[PDB]
Amino acid sequence: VIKEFMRFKVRMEGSVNGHEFEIEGEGEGRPYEGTQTAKLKVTKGGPLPFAWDILSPQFSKAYVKHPADIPDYLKLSFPEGFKWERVMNFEDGGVVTVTQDSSLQDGEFIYKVKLRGTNFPSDGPVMQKKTMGWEASTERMYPEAELKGEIKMRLKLKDGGHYDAEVKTTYMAKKPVQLPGAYKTDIKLDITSHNEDYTIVEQYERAEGRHS
């Protein structure tokens, strides 16, 4: 079912600081090499009055290269797939919460995202579009029963310095699946291209599982 080259479609319904939008894109990748690329399009609410970076990590954990003695719980969940829920807490009191339902149909993954960012100061970096990209992350993974994961993510600032987020994600597979032990996943997401006002965006993520 999960071939060595997979595609996916993704939809997000969002609103940040009260401003509602809708995003739709298509991605592709090799789920066993850890590489993927999406192309997101802003179909409603464009252009956005906030930084694209707070959205890019919500657009695909089935594409994480796992070694062989670490159960690939998210891959193994398919064809039924899984849901994740996440809560980012930024250092200036911004709060993104996401919920996602991944699933396989017709040979490609189908992503439905719902996002709600609030409390971002109107003159901080997210609302002022003063960020330019995420640093490399490392998500600590650990195990009803479900897979959980904590990250500390830095976000580069345009003028200098960083801006941090405390992320806590929770993945549940839609069917019983063997959970792994505690391990770590190394992540680096990249905006590879974008048009002027960030209404057409392309992303690249590589993720790899390893023991601590």
CATH class: Mainly Beta
The rough form would be described as globular
Distance between the termini: 30 Å
So how many helices? 1
Secondary-structure class: mainly beta
Write out the strand line-up for the largest beta sheet, numbering strands in chain order: 1-2-3-12-11-8-9-10-4-5-6
Work out the strand percent.
Answer: over 45%
Radius of gyration: 16 Å
Examine the coordinates and then state which fold CATH places here, giving the name of the CATH topology. Answer: Green Fluorescent Protein
CATH superfamily: Green fluorescent protein
The number of strands is: 12
Which sequence of SSEs, written as H and E, runs from N to C?
Answer: EEEHEEEEEEEEE
Biggest sheet architecture: 11 strands, mixed, barrel
Helical content band:
under 10%
Query: How many domains comprise the coordinates?
Result: 1
CATH architecture: Beta Barrel
Keywords: Calcium, Luminescence, Metal-binding, Photoprotein
Pfam families: GFP
Family: Belongs to the GFP family.
Protein name: Red fluorescent protein
